[model samples]
Target chain A: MYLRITNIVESSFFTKFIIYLIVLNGITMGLETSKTFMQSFGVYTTLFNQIVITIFTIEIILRIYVHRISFFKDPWSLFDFFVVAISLVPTSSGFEILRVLRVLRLFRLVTAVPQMRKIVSALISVIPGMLSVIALMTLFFYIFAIMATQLFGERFPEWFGTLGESFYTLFQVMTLESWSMGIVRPLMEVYPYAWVFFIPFIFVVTFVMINLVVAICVDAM
Target chain B: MYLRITNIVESSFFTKFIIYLIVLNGITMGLETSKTFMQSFGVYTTLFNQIVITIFTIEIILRIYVHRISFFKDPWSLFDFFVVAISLVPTSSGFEILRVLRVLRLFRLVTAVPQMRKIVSALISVIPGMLSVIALMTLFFYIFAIMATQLFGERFPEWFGTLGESFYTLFQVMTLESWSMGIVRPLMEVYPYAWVFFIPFIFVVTFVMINLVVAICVDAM
Candidate 1:
């Protein structure tokens, strides 16, 4: 009897069904955001969500029973388990943040799809080296943000008035959108030498970041 | 005589002086942007610019004389030659664009500083493979922009009305800034299924591009 249940859980057909359910569940959550859809089928969508979660939990239970302790050994399995565990939370009366957490259930697509899982694992593999680079990046980010606040904060109060504001705009600049024509050009009118600061900021963040990327990719290979 | 001039040009003190003059020229160009500074020292600033450009032209002539036609073999040497050649353009009554071209001389720092040259050349070395990825990226970009216009053009005219506008905001979204909250969230209000379009868009562009990046980096390594 146990073998029969395990066979069904691991079967290709059963996995296909689970993917469809997850996708439909994702659609319903997306539809829930629209007031028009909510007014007409809100209760039905809620019921459907409950049904999907029930099926998912049952599937998880069978898988765990099949693998026993081995299920927890794989990170992907743990990911599946964690995603299901969160869905079990009573979001209706729980903290509003729990409702937002429900939407994250869509990430199950990463585990459900083979291609996504491959890409995600590849991304995860680089994190060890990437983390050090990220630390270095954040260190410089903080240093530049503080300096931005000190220098341009008084003049361009909108972008760099406080440390928080500076960090936000710094991210905007770092992303390469509106950095030159939008922020840099306007600020230069007042502070003739403002590019002195902005130029090095980009050089360090942009060019410097690429070195780390090349290092990790090379190291990973 | 040619060997003596080449020796001086390649000397440590001479390179240091050229770097200083390039930096100071960059500062003066920046200062010229300020109406206040322009009022006080604009005349001298222009005079100083002429002096610097004249010196730069002489330096280039000496370098070319030193290396003969072989000077053109190195990209960095061509970059210096091109910058000096453009500066010779009479910008006083010429196209206003010529003035902006003068500011690009600041990129001389890349050729002037050994570290900067190393980073830039590393960047350039990756370009052969990177171009194919960029072409693929642009192809998908064109397809998506067309679909975006077809689907959301009527409702979100500001973003998707014209192909140009769609391309612009698509780049904004691609950069991962204000993509979710600023653009996507507001659009979802009208079309509950907007995410159906955006999710796949990001999955393709962001994840897909990373694969190409990994491949090239690993290949290069």
Candidate 2:
């Protein structure tokens, strides 16, 4: 009986089945977005989602039972387990936000595709270096956040009123998303020398610091 | 005579003098931003700016004369020439924005500081690899932008109204800046399964694709 169960679990057909369900689940999730689609086929859509979830749950249980404690040792398995588990949580109205997480199940594609798995593993291998870069970024952000709060707080209370807001805005600036046109330009109109503050801020955070993070990550790879 | 000129230009004092002028010009630009400061120091600041501009022009001329045609071969020299030359342009009120370009002179610090120059060149060295990743990104972006325009354009005209708008909004979404709270959440209220569209979109674009770019860049490094 043990060998029989193991054979089915390891079979290529089972993997293909799970991949099929994931694709179907992805479709159903997309369908759930259209109100008209839901009104027309709400019952079938819900039933379809529940059925897919049940099959995924069964697949996880069979894998766990076969692999026993060894299954938990694999990080990819752990990721799969958690994604399945999160979906099983009761979706009370207060937990509506949790529903957004169901789509994360699509990330199983990473595990499903060998190339993606290799890429992700390569990325994970660099986590130690990434951590240091992250630490440096945090320090840079904190210093600038404090400086921004002190410099622009009086003039632009909405953006730099507190350290938290400053950090958030600075993070946005680091991404170069409308930093010049949206935020800095308007501020420049008021505090003409604002570029003195922001230009260097961009230079340090976006130009120099981000490259260091890239360099570290690249070195690790 | 040639040896004397070369010695003067290459001397520590000459370098120090240029650095000093760059710092002073930075201050003058900042002062130009404040109306109160300008009211008090307008004449002196303007004079200081013109004097600094003249000195930089003379420095550029001296460097060119010393290097002769060899000056044009060095990209940094050309950069120095353009920056100084831009300031020499006649600035009318209509061309006030051109005045802001003066701040770019501060970037001479890249050429001035050896460490900064090394970091920048390291970044530049990876540009060839970065271009392919960028091409991949552009392709991904174009496909998703078209999909978004077809799917959500009718409903979210402000954001996904056209190909250009969709591209802009998708770029913002990929940056993870208020994407969920600011955009997708509101859309989800009307179209209950909008998360299906956006969540996977975020995963694919922001999480997976961006990491691919990072991986490519790291590999090049």
Candidate 3:
């Protein structure tokens, strides 16, 4: 009789119920964002929300009971369990952040669907290679910033006064927002003629960073 | 005599001098931008520029002399020769545009240096793949825009007034510039509560277009 209960708990019919219910629960959660909708439907919304949570608790306990220790071995199972527990953990001011109920519940969409999980997994896989470009970019910034501060430090102290400040200014310049009139052109009135330094820096930095973006594209696939 | 002349013209030493001369010529052209520098060295600068032009004429003639029909076979050779002709083609009244002397001459940096050429060569390689994302983006814009115009048509006419205007508005929204305040928040006062549509649009568009950026990164590498 207990083994028969476990078979029903692990059944595809029940699993599909949770998957579709999560989506419906998510829709209701989103619809609750509007005050007009909530004022009218608050009773039913709350009733439905509680029912969804109750169903989640039952499904989770059944999976845990059936699979036992192996349930936690699958990280996705543990992740969804963690999310459910957090939603359950919130109380009156005992760190009420987990009471951000819908976001936590909505996050389970990834756990519920293979497509969603793969999208997130592919996204996470990109981080290691992504950091290489960032490290290289930071290195370039530090080296050029030191050079920038040394040359433009005294002449244009406002922008390149300190090495740290110069890094921020170089960041601004890197965005090409005001490189012409706001920065380099103003510095043209001063020494190092600025253009000789800034122009090539723009061209070189743009090329290097463009390559970095290209690296990000390659790794994402 | 002609064979010896052709051999000397095609020699490594002569080619290297031309390469280095283009660099110097470009440097002088940049220096001439500052009136202070020009005032100090105008006579010598003019002399050097005239001499560089004279050298370009002779080098091009010898290249044409030796390679004959094959001179235009290499795009790089034709490109440099075209640059020289444009510099030689400037007039007093009939479109002084080609007289953008330094820019035209400075472009020879790619022609003069193999590294510079390959940097550009690799750069041009990414455009075809780059356009794929743009086309996809445009398609999304059109589809979403028609829906946007149909739904938010009369009430929020300022933004989603027409399909064309909605497309432009969507482009602005995609930049995430003033999306919430300038757009969806105002539309929240109207129907379509907008969070349901706009929020998903942002997430889906961001993900889809993030994949575009990732594509660019891969193709560039």
Candidate 4:
């Protein structure tokens, strides 16, 4: 098996394609970093940016040729293309350098085509089942936030300031820090009941939410 | 359903116990602020500390009487007992206090009596399955970490660093951001051929790991 992989690595055209992408992206990264235009003459930066854009466009064409339209069937692939494409679209004239999309290009680097296919396949397989869990969690958060507003809002307006603040606080609390400790810990002395509320938050986040997520991951694996 | 919760809330016993805990914990948090303690009298500070400890002892005795050892059979219940028990032990005296335990007390706050039993029973019912999933994930992490170190270390020592750092970085990339671009964009520059290594990492961490966890959770749910 090892010998076969080594042979494939040595022989496959796909290896060459991968090499091309790596070098191309690397050059783009360097050009963006060195401010290639700032060091050179006036028209050079614009010309250089145009050249990079052309290379980026050709890279996309090659990817599509190899992988076909189904490449875009995967969202991440589409995202990569979008990042590159949008970065090139002259949103404004002088600032034609696509920074955000360039940063997103880093994503394509981490995820490989074959591996990404597996991930997408698995995620697609699990979405229907996981949706219910997500719905239940969101429902709990919403209902709990409403109840908390009714019960505790008058005392801790900062926490239950509005539905928005209530939800934000809930979001923060979901990270398993206490309302008083992590969020309101600084203000603990001001509110009598704030610290104790953290206990219930802990149970929901740490015990229930964590258990729920871990249980699902295990089943999927 | 709401009425039942309200009925319990309205009860003298629940109200008194909750208020007592809130006030006691609040005062402790107050002292931890140091500014509050400095502003207050020195003798009162020492007396307040003693009172807090004395009240905590009473709270434990009351809990043991109410919940009995059977309560400790549940992990969350055990967590509560743990917080209390650890706080009481003399050896932990100088450092460990009820302050931290107060944060963990979320378990007892959540379980109440009925919800407590339901969740505890659920926990007990799910243990074997949960343990298996945990075992699998741990095994995955260890095996993959080894493979990643062997496969990519020579080419990307700056990113991989050590075996542990690679594992940690991989885990973060899995949970946090799309690491593909960050990894690939640079590698494409340095080891244009190394992009192939990243494909699997991106696919597994970004797409597969979450779905895997979620699927396992849904099935269990």
The best candidate in terms of TM-score: 2
Q: What is residue A48's positional error in candidate 2, in angstroms?
A: 0.7
lDDT of 3 at A145: 71
- TM-score, model 1, chain B versus true chain B: 0.83
Which is the leading candidate under lDDT? 1
lDDT of 2 at B65: 79
Each model's lDDT: 0.78, 0.75, 0.73, 0.57
Clashing pairs for predicted structure model 3, backbone only: A214-B217, A217-B214, A218-B218
**Between the candidate structures 3 and 4, which one is better when assessed by lDDT?**
3
Cα lDDT tens digits for candidate 2, A89-175: 876666544565666687675665465566567645656655666797789889989999998998888679889768757866775
> Cα miss at A166, model 4 (Å)?
16
DockQ, each predicted model: 0.07, 0.06, 0.08, 0.07
lDDT tens readout by residue for model 4, A76-120: 668768877776767565553554455565455545455756776
Instruction: Write down the DockQ of candidate 2.
Output: 0.06
Q: What 10-residue stretch in candidate 1 chain A is worst by lDDT?
A: A131-140
The CAPRI category of model 3 is incorrect
Poorly placed runs, candidate 4 (over 4 Å): A1-221, B1-52, B62-77, B89-102, B111-131, B151-159, B176-178, B205-221
Model 4 chain B: lowest-lDDT 10 consecutive positions: B99-108
Q: For all candidates listed, what's the TM-score of chain B alone?
A: 0.83, 0.85, 0.65, 0.62
Better of 1 and 3 by DockQ: 3
lDDT of 1: 0.78
**Per-residue C-alpha lDDT of model 1 across residues A9-74, encoded as one tens digit per residue:** 889998999899888998888899999999999899989988988998998899899899999998
Task: Specify the poorest-scoring 10-residue window by lDDT in model 4 chain A.
Answer: A176-185
Across B102-184, the per-residue lDDT of candidate 1 in tens digits comes to 66577776687786666556655766766777799999889889989887889988778878657766766775656777789
